[PDB]
Design an enzyme around this catalytic site. Structure first.
Site, PDB file in Angstrom:
ATOM      1  N   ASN A 108       2.528  15.419  14.399  1.00 31.29           N
ATOM      2  CA  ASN A 108       1.868  15.208  15.678  1.00 31.29           C
ATOM      3  C   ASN A 108       2.204  13.831  16.229  1.00 31.29           C
ATOM      4  OD1 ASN A 108      -0.139  17.603  16.224  1.00 31.29           O
ATOM      5  ND2 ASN A 108      -0.263  17.168  14.025  1.00 31.29           N
ATOM      6  N   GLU A 133       1.429  16.588   8.052  1.00 34.17           N
ATOM      7  CA  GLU A 133       0.920  17.287   9.218  1.00 34.17           C
ATOM      8  C   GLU A 133       0.577  16.314  10.332  1.00 34.17           C
ATOM      9  OE1 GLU A 133       1.003  20.518   9.442  1.00 34.17           O
ATOM     10  OE2 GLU A 133       0.418  20.366  11.543  1.00 34.17           O
ATOM     11  N   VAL A 185      -3.394  19.700  12.939  1.00 35.92           N
ATOM     12  CA  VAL A 185      -4.200  18.610  12.401  1.00 35.92           C
ATOM     13  C   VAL A 185      -5.652  19.012  12.113  1.00 35.92           C
ATOM     14  CG1 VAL A 185      -4.982  17.624  14.592  1.00 35.92           C
ATOM     15  CG2 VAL A 185      -4.621  16.135  12.588  1.00 35.92           C
ATOM     16  N   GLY A 245       3.977  24.679  12.084  1.00 35.38           N
ATOM     17  CA  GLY A 245       2.957  23.759  11.579  1.00 35.38           C
ATOM     18  C   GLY A 245       1.546  24.320  11.624  1.00 35.38           C
ATOM     19  N   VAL A 246       0.707  23.876  10.690  1.00 33.82           N
ATOM     20  CA  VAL A 246      -0.680  24.379  10.578  1.00 33.82           C
ATOM     21  C   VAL A 246      -1.679  23.728  11.537  1.00 33.82           C
ATOM     22  CG1 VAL A 246      -0.351  25.195   8.240  1.00 33.82           C
ATOM     23  CG2 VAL A 246      -1.254  22.881   8.597  1.00 33.82           C
ATOM     24  N   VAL A 249     -10.288  23.285  16.183  1.00 34.94           N
ATOM     25  CA  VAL A 249      -9.944  24.672  16.456  1.00 34.94           C
ATOM     26  C   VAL A 249      -8.604  24.959  15.813  1.00 34.94           C
ATOM     27  CG1 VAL A 249      -9.319  26.320  18.260  1.00 34.94           C
ATOM     28  CG2 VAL A 249     -11.286  24.830  18.557  1.00 34.94           C
ATOM     29  N   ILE A 307      -8.540  20.023  19.631  1.00 28.76           N
ATOM     30  CA  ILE A 307      -7.376  20.003  18.747  1.00 28.76           C
ATOM     31  C   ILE A 307      -7.795  19.718  17.298  1.00 28.76           C
ATOM     32  CG2 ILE A 307      -5.139  18.912  18.300  1.00 28.76           C
ATOM     33  CD1 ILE A 307      -5.318  18.162  21.434  1.00 28.76           C
ATOM     34  N   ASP A 341       0.883   6.034  16.579  1.00 27.91           N
ATOM     35  CA  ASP A 341       2.046   6.065  17.452  1.00 27.91           C
ATOM     36  C   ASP A 341       1.763   5.195  18.660  1.00 27.91           C
ATOM     37  OD1 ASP A 341       0.356   8.585  18.359  1.00 27.91           O
ATOM     38  OD2 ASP A 341       1.581   7.984  20.067  1.00 27.91           O
TER      39      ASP A 341
HETATM   40  C1  LIG Z   1      -3.187  16.011  17.929  1.00 26.54           C
HETATM   41  O1  LIG Z   1      -2.474  14.788  17.618  1.00 26.54           O
HETATM   42  C2  LIG Z   1      -2.777  14.187  16.463  1.00 26.54           C
HETATM   43  O2  LIG Z   1      -3.496  14.671  15.625  1.00 26.54           O
HETATM   44  C3  LIG Z   1      -2.113  12.861  16.325  1.00 26.54           C
HETATM   45  C4  LIG Z   1      -1.280  12.371  17.329  1.00 26.54           C
HETATM   46  C5  LIG Z   1      -0.671  11.139  17.197  1.00 26.54           C
HETATM   47  C6  LIG Z   1      -0.892  10.365  16.063  1.00 26.54           C
HETATM   48  O3  LIG Z   1      -0.319   9.140  15.921  1.00 26.54           O
HETATM   49  C7  LIG Z   1      -1.725  10.850  15.049  1.00 26.54           C
HETATM   50  O4  LIG Z   1      -1.931  10.090  13.942  1.00 26.54           O
HETATM   51  C8  LIG Z   1      -2.326  12.094  15.178  1.00 26.54           C
END
Ligand SMILES: COC(=O)c1ccc(O)c(O)c1
Ligand SMILES: COC(=O)c1ccc(O)c(O)c1
Ligand SMILES: Nc1nc2ccccc2[nH]1
Lengths: 188, 185
Positions: free
Chosen positions: B31, B27, B87, B84-85, B82, B79, B58
């Protein structure tokens, strides 16, 4: 309950000096008294257990157990999980909370951890009695420094409460040392 | 998040056979890939740490940090909390989750425990870099029996993702035994 979890102190009071810790008990007791007042026998029992949990029980009607039409869970669960500050605050800030409701000849049991129900409220048996029992273990992730219940703080308040609530028998038991008190004012 | 905490299995997958546990990683990776795709360098790094947590980073633009106009907290917190399901599910089922966002010259950090923010998203320093990093410690109150990440389970999925997301570099590192891979199509 995430709003309480985010800022516990705004809902229960100071979580470090013991005042919030004891407020947990008094919130539950307020609900128990309300339950006790609706019946004719009217007895509540507050017990400080040896594992530093506290249970409050009354011999009243038993809080409602039927499925709430909109929420889709038992009324008891709605009360425990939807935002005196409300028992849901106590549930949220308890690492464990056990609920036992005796009503309509049936025993209903449910367990929560940090406000999260471990299963739906279940009828586990039969009973000739009525009432509600809540036993909770204050969350040690929230309550710091003062984490044990002071008998004197509870006894003083329960004594004061007995005079405002005529006919209601209030028992306090400390299983850590065997101490007991009985506050019952029969005025009115 | 209580709906998730109440029925974890229905959101993440079986919490006893290792299925749900590994889905937690996937998950987050979804993202991270989305974020990487919008950037220039296009690389994500997935690391299995020795204390049984997983981090995914990233080199993208950094997820939004400004206050959400309606919710009244940072967009990142929205995000994370609150439904794909999403994060938010991972956050709810993690005993700890650490978030780091590098964006617009600043480093932002936030810690959650069981989906509960320990403080608001906060600026902790300056940086030239951009990107997002999430490290999460799966809740052992939720995940039973299989509690340790299996490298090959992650590698298999990450390989499939590298073909589908062909411009993105994916690195997998295991700090427990030093195994690593680099998936790039
Ligand atoms: C809402 O985005 C995320 O939860 C998210 C975005 C980029 C990432 O590298 C990561 O590990 C988590
Ligand atoms: C809302 O009702 C309660 O939470 C409640 C009611 C009666 C009790 O004896 C008790 O311990 C808790
Ligand atoms: N230990 C622990 N702390 C928690 C807080 C919220 C929900 C679940 C939790 N489990």
């Amino acid at each position: 309950l995430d709003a309480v979890r985010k800022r516990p102190g705004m809902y229960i009071g100071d979580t470090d000096d013991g005042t919030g810790l004891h407020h947990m008990v008094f919130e539950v007791v307020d609900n128990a008294i309300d339950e006790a007042l609706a019946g004719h026998c009217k007895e509540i029992i507050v017990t400080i257990h040896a594992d530093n949990s506290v249970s409050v029980q009354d011999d009243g009607r038993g809080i409602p157990t039927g499925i709430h039409p909109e929420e889709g869970v038992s009324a008891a669960e709605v009360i425990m999980t939807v935002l005196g500050v409300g028992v849901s605050v106590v549930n949220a800030l308890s690492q464990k909370l056990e609920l036992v409701i005796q009503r309509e000849g049936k025993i209903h049991r449910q367990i929560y951890e940090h406000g999260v129900p471990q299963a739906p409220l279940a009828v586990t048996g039969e009973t000739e009695k009525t009432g509600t029992m809540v036993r909770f273990w204050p969350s040690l992730e929230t309550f710091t420094n003062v984490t044990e219940f002071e008998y004197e703080i509870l006894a003083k308040r329960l004594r004061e409460l007995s005079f405002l609530n005529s006919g209601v028998s209030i028992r306090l038991r400390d299983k850590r040392d065997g101490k007991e008190d009985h506050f019952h004012y029969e005025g009115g």
